[PDB]
Amino acid sequence: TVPDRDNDGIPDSLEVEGYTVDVKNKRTFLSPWISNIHEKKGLTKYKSSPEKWSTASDPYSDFEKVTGRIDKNVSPEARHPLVAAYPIVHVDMENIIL
Amino acid sequence: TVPDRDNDGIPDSLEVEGYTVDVKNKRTFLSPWISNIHEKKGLTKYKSSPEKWSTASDPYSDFEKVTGRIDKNVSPEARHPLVAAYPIVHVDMENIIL
Amino acid sequence: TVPDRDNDGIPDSLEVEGYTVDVKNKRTFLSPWISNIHEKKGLTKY
Amino acid sequence: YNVLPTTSLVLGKNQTLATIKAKENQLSQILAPNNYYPSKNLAPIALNAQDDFSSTPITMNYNQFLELEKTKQLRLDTDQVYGNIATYNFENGRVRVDTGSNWSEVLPQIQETTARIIFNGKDLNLVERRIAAVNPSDPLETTKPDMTLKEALKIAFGFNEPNGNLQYQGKDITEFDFNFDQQTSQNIKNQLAELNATNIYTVLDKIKLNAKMNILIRDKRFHYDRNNIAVGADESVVKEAHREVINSSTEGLLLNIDKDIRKILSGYIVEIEDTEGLKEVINDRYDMLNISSLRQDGKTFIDFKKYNDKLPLYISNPNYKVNVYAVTKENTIINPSENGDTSTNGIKKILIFSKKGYEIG
Amino acid sequence: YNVLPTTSLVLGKNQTLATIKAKENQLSQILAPNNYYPSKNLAPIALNAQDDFSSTPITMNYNQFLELEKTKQLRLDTDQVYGNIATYNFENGRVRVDTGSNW
Amino acid sequence: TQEEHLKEIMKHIVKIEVKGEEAVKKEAAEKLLEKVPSDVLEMYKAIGGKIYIVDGDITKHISLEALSEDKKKIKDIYGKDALLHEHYVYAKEGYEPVLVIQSSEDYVENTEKALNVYYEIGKILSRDILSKINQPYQKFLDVLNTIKNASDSDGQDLLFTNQLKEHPTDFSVEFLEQNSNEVQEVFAKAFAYYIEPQHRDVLQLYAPEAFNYMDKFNEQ
Numbered sequence A, B: 001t002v003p004d005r006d007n008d009g010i011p012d013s014l015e016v017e018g019y020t021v022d023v024k025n026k027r028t029f030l031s032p033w034i035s036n037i038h039e040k041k042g043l044t045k046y047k048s049s050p051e052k053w054s055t056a057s058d059p060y061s062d063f064e065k066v067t068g069r070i071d072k073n074v075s076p077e078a079r080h081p082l083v084a085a086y087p088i089v090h091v092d093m094e095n096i097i098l
Numbered sequence C: 001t002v003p004d005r006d007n008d009g010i011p012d013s014l015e016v017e018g019y020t021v022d023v024k025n026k027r028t029f030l031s032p033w034i035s036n037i038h039e040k041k042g043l044t045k046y
Numbered sequence D: 001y002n003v004l005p006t007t008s009l010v011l012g013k014n015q016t017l018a019t020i021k022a023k024e025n026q027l028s029q030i031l032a033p034n035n036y037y038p039s040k041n042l043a044p045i046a047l048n049a050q051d052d053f054s055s056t057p058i059t060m061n062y063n064q065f066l067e068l069e070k071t072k073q074l075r076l077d078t079d080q081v082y083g084n085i086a087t088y089n090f091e092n093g094r095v096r097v098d099t100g101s102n103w104s105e106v107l108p109q110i111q112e113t114t115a116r117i118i119f120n121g122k123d124l125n126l127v128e129r130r131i132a133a134v135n136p137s138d139p140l141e142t143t144k145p146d147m148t149l150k151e152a153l154k155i156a157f158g159f160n161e162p163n164g165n166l167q168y169q170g171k172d173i174t175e176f177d178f179n180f181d182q183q184t185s186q187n188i189k190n191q192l193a194e195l196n197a198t199n200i201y202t203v204l205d206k207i208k209l210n211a212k213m214n215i216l217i218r219d220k221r222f223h224y225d226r227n228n229i230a231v232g233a234d235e236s237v238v239k240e241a242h243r244e245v246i247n248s249s250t251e252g253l254l255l256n257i258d259k260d261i262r263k264i265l266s267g268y269i270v271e272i273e274d275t276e277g278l279k280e281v282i283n284d285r286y287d288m289l290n291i292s293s294l295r296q297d298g299k300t301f302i303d304f305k306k307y308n309d310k311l312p313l314y315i316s317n318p319n320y321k322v323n324v325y326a327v328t329k330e331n332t333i334i335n336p337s338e339n340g341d342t343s344t345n346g347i348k349k350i351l352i353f354s355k356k357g358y359e360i361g
Numbered sequence E: 001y002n003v004l005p006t007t008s009l010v011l012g013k014n015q016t017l018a019t020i021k022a023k024e025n026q027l028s029q030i031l032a033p034n035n036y037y038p039s040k041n042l043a044p045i046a047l048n049a050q051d052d053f054s055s056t057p058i059t060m061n062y063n064q065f066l067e068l069e070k071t072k073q074l075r076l077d078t079d080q081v082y083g084n085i086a087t088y089n090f091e092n093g094r095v096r097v098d099t100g101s102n103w
Numbered sequence F: 001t002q003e004e005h006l007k008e009i010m011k012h013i014v015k016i017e018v019k020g021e022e023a024v025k026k027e028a029a030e031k032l033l034e035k036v037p038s039d040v041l042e043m044y045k046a047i048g049g050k051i052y053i054v055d056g057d058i059t060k061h062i063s064l065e066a067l068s069e070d071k072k073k074i075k076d077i078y079g080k081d082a083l084l085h086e087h088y089v090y091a092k093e094g095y096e097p098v099l100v101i102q103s104s105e106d107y108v109e110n111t112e113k114a115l116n117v118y119y120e121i122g123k124i125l126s127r128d129i130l131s132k133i134n135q136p137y138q139k140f141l142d143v144l145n146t147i148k149n150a151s152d153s154d155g156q157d158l159l160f161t162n163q164l165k166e167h168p169t170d171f172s173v174e175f176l177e178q179n180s181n182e183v184q185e186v187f188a189k190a191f192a193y194y195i196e197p198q199h200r201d202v203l204q205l206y207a208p209e210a211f212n213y214m215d216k217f218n219e220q
């Protein structure tokens, strides 16, 4: 039994040492980082906290963010675990009626 | 099975005799206090109640307060277990309209 | 035990490789795709 | 999801009329990023109620009514915004809204654990990104991998080193300038003191980031105001973008003006110079500057006819000079001078267009 | 979290005009320490209601009106403040508000 | 709960140690043979049988050179044509029988790929292990009749070729002699559907008799 203290479905040594997600036929596989293969494919090496379920503390796990099992309205540059995902809302006023 | 009467995830003899929290690679480890190592690192020796889940009786455990698994809006000087964490709210009145 | 990661009651290799649904007497049967039979019946590969 | 802003109607300096939470008529179910509620083609929504069941209009007394009709200063503040998170379900894949949780729980957790970087190189628009960085005094926060500045700029803004040099699009990083608040500037000072380096641009792969940092990255070309909006360039840059003339007519000018550049120009000045030298200005008012239209083909179009009573220019002699000058936002005026000056006399104009009369048509 | 102060409008020495609990227009979701609601750049909020559904203005009679326009002494007391705790969850790390518990 | 679903999907998703391409290719082939009962595998090496797992084109092999280019035109288990150098299994008819397959990941994915390999194994039994003491042979000859004359042509659209279906007369007890080829292709088909676990119920469905026999056959 491999440990995952952060309980985010992804073990701790992989989050420390680097990992990636890769499809093979139609199936996503959580590989640890190997520079001989994944670098040639252009896959991005990922590191995150072994003790944070969400390393950016946003309400989305590390695994959901790297897997894609997320609200798709999240911007693609926010799909990295060290990138936070949050709304910024402000209201403008176009017209007055008295 | 080590006892923790206060049920705060941290045993009683450590809360009595002194302890600390230290990361090693990316992982927080709850050590008892050793002056040869932790004093050179600048780690603060911690003591708390073996029977209080929250020694300061604030709604945060001793373990959450030393670990960091807390609301981060808590001030850093309130991260010590013998330091209480509580809001102080008062309302000022800027203007009247009659 | 055949896997169904999507947990939708239908296994993964069938969803990948093609399948169909066919009644036999009064009962729906989830077959994988066979072009000798289901194509002659007009069943749509899924 | 389920957006309910809490806003405030304010008169004057700080005379608050009212504070209103958005009601069920004012609910927004979805507000995806880079979007509006309602959409831009539709008309904005109406807020006119104070009750929780929306049965009382927003009331103003007499003196405030007089002051409003005198001063016309009625501002709107956004105090706080209510709204929920929808989370993924591992059961059926369906992302479902928890009505219990809200972003109120989450946003200060993000703010106290990340470094914030604001950058405006994408069409002069302030883009904010928060990146998780280590607070050393927090043991759980130290469990994160280390973040250099260059890696952060690469993953956050889509930067690259296509030739070993950090670039945003085709622009070098060295054409951008850095700004820090006092704590972050002090920490960067300490890190550069330890690294014994002077240029920050050389050591971007070594800058260790921390929580609660604030990094403003702007373009070195343009000039900025208090609110860090792009207000105006140097003369060398403004001229460089106008070196592409498409259509020369006595009715207007068609140019391929750069989209970034044009956004800091308030308007244009059109005059005619004698062969000995006169200054006869067609659009000789402070509010006769707006002639520059933007066609949908990506080419900015100037129009002389708009402020010449529907008629083209007047070429008294085809050996004159037809001058067209531009006005930056930092140089423009919006009211006449002290006495009565409704003219283009005291304006810092910039030479963009100067061609003869036989070279137009 | 979910700050609802109970305040009091008072004339004179101790002549209390009214005691008002903060309503849903006056709710503050977050009040972090060393902060203001609303922020200092923005304008302060408006309290003008007595009903639980905010349909009655705060009323003053004649003699109090005369005494207010003479003396200009109108003070504001903060009697008690309602507000909740958000606690850490060991399940997913998410700090969640218990609406039941209060400070 | 949501975490239990997470443990299901990850055990499927996350891998740790890499076997490497060469080991995975070999292992995938081994897993196929594990479905085949060793009942017939031992009888295959008993008659001098060799199992090979080559890479690339099968035609480029040492134990199989350029033998008779006509047989490099093949039909699958569906009866659709195929060029042997693009295929991934072939069995050899000779005094030294030998089976050779390509190696792929897809033998734990493509049930279609597996189904044709169990098909070729079905041939091997039906001739190289069965043609010897086939006679009196009536035990399988009678169940093949039932597929022919019955309602629901499905079973004969599954197992018979485009010839045995259209042969009007019932099946004579001489056809197996003249056409030991065709009657053993059918046995090769119904074998493969039965052995492949997911097409098994399909055999019980469309051809209940052929299943009913092949179920009885192996286990006793």
Ligand SMILES: [Ca+2]
Pocket (backbone or CB within 6 Å): A004, A005, A006, A007, A008, A009, A010, A011, A012, A015, A049, A050, A051
């Ligand atoms: Ca993990």
Ligand SMILES: [Ca+2]
Pocket (backbone or CB within 6 Å): A006, A008, A015, A048, A049, A050, A051, A052, A053, A054, A055, A062
């Ligand atoms: Ca994690």
Ligand SMILES: [Ca+2]
Pocket (backbone or CB within 6 Å): B004, B005, B006, B007, B008, B009, B010, B011, B012, B015, B049, B050, B051
């Ligand atoms: Ca304890």
Ligand SMILES: [Ca+2]
Pocket (backbone or CB within 6 Å): B006, B008, B015, B048, B049, B050, B051, B052, B053, B054, B055, B062
């Ligand atoms: Ca304790």
Ligand SMILES: [Ca+2]
Pocket (backbone or CB within 6 Å): C004, C005, C006, C007, C008, C009, C010, C011, C012, C015
């Ligand atoms: Ca499925």
